[PDB]
Amino acid sequence: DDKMDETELLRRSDGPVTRDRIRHDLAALGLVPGDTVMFHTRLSAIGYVSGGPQTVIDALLDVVGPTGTLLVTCGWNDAPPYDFTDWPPAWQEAVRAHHPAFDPRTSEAEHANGRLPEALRRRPGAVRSRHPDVSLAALGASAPALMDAHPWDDPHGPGSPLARLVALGGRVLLLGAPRDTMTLLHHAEALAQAPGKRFVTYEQPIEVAGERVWRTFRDIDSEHGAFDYSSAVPEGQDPFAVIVGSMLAAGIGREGFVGAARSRLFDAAPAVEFGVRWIEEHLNRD
Amino acid sequence: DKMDETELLRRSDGPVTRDRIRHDLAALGLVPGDTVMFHTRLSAIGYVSGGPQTVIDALLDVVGPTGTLLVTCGWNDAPPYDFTDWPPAWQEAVRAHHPAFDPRTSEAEHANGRLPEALRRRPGAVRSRHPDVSLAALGASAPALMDAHPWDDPHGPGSPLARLVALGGRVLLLGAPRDTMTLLHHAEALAQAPGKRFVTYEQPIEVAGERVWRTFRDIDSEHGAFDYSSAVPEGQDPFAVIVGSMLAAGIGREGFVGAARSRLFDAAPAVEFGVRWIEEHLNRD
Ligand SMILES: [Cl-]
């Protein structure tokens, strides 16, 4: 029921949530002109947002202003599965012969990231990074250098957009999104040194020189965790949720509300520094 | 989700590729130069390698550069028709702050699925200007089909749907159920019968760079342009009944595209049939 969904969201926020009200709530959280902010969104948690994703994006642009930048994690919803080489031989041949290349302009973001990354990447002037598995998108003053030349291998590591967010003094905003959605902690996993690090190898079709070619990629296991967190994390619990919870308890990050959405704003450099130290201390046992 | 893939892969007995869809579309009767409005239920096709992009590429492969694809978009985040029933403070917030419809960025209705949202993002795609029932089109006839969508009676004469009929266009249901045929709203707008139901609603648009509120009139495309209670059996959707009767009268062809039950109609005889069906069932002189 469409009617119903609207009724519940209106009730949740006690009426429509507007662009200027979101702008006000974001400034109260600590977002300021000139910031670069990567943001994860659970749109319905805000309430009934008058104008949907476009209103959230324009409120964010109002706060950071023309010299600031917004960033999201996109990925590729219709990528071939990592394990597509475990299918009957005629099937995977069909994939290898006919699966289209990743295309930054048209390939849709992963559906699990919700509507906001797919709205951001389609904004006029938005820039989407070239990686077929873990592309980001950005909008604003620093968007070309942040997204430029996404490193094929180790795409969460030293050369990556996430590293550039840290070096810029950027921020991470969870906008109703839960603590485990903080993508930036994959950059922490990529930097962290501890035994038992998990890596993945997969292939995906990309377009280079205007022709479609397959490429093999290496990354940390950003799906099941770059380590076994068995010893440091109660089972049933998500490692990133535990790290961010400890982060917050150590005084890194500010919590508040944007509409009806429980929201958290972090500086990216201390969050990554905390995350790598968390992983190395819990997992090295020296 | 690996089981999700196993379900889809079992449904189509392996990946459905661009070439396989093109093959099945041609066998259903789509030809080079066709203009085709299509409604899609991706999961009914099976495991489509490449998702919506692959469906669109296959359709372009069949109709070629002289052909045109059309979809219905609408506007997912339009103000609800009845926001003017809300408490005064809530409707004043919508009036002062709801952003204008923007054909380049306003999202299609979530219920229309992922194909319309992918089509309108293609390079060269054209999206009509109507804030409530916009269409999008891609190909040689897209500018003329989408141009100057009438504000009032947006399914009536001179609308994109009327232009699809006049062009000799077609309608494709690609695993979509018989009741998503948008073209039959054009039949409802043309049909002469008692008790026709209309809606009047307000939506923000941009006119010469300024955001303005406008009032719009349409047939009730949400609840049905007529009370169909005496014309259809209980629990059946009117458009499904009309399309079923259309098929049984020899209008339209049916087959499979991948695993998806699919139906292809010529738009001019579909609308003529739909108008007659409504006038015969709802006048009963
Ligand atoms: Cl490049």
Residue numbers in the entry:
A (entry chain B): -2 to 283
B (entry chain A): -1 to 283
Task: Provide the authors' own sentences about this structure as they appear in the paper.
Here, we conduct a comprehensive functional analysis of the Antibiotic_NAT family of aminoglycoside acetyltransferases. AG resistance is primarily conferred by three classes of aminoglycoside-modifying enzymes (AMEs): phosphotransferases (APHs), nucleotidylyltransferases (ANTs), and acetyltransferases (AACs). AMEs permanently alter the AG substrate, preventing them from binding to their target, the A-site of the 16S rRNA in the bacterial ribosome. The fold typical of the Antibiotic_NAT family is evident in all structures, composed of 13 α-helices and 8 β-strands, and determined structures superpose with pairwise RMSD’s 0.8–1.0 Å between 197 to 266 matching Cα atoms.
We found that the Group 2 member AAC(3)-Xa, derived from an Actinomycetes, is limited in its AG specificity to the 4,6-disubstituted AGs kanamycin and tobramycin; the only other Group 2 member tested in our host E. coli was AAC(3)-IXa and did not convey any detectable AG resistance. As indicated by our AG susceptibility testing, the activity of AAC(3)-Xa is limited to tobramycin and kanamycin. To rationalize this strict specificity, we modeled the position of kanamycin into the active site of the apoenzyme structure based on the position of gentamicin bound to AAC(3)-IVa. This analysis suggested that gentamicin would not be accommodated due to the Tyr79 and Asp130 residues, which would clash with the 4”-OH group or the methylated 3”-amine of the corresponding AG substrate, respectively. Based on comparative analysis of the AAC(3)-Xa and AAC(3)-IVa•apramycin complex structures, Tyr79 would also introduce a steric clash with this AG in the AAC(3)-Xa active site. Notably, Tyr79, Asp130, Glu220, and adjacent active site residues are highly conserved in Antibiotic_NAT Group 2, suggesting these are critical determinants for restricting the specificity of these enzymes. In contrast, the AAC(3)-Xa enzyme exists as a monomer in solution despite forming a dimer in the crystal lattice. Representatives of Antibiotic_NAT Groups 2 and 4 were the most restricted in their specificity, and this was reflected in more constrained and smaller active sites, as revealed by the structures of AAC(3)-IIb and AAC(3)-Xa.
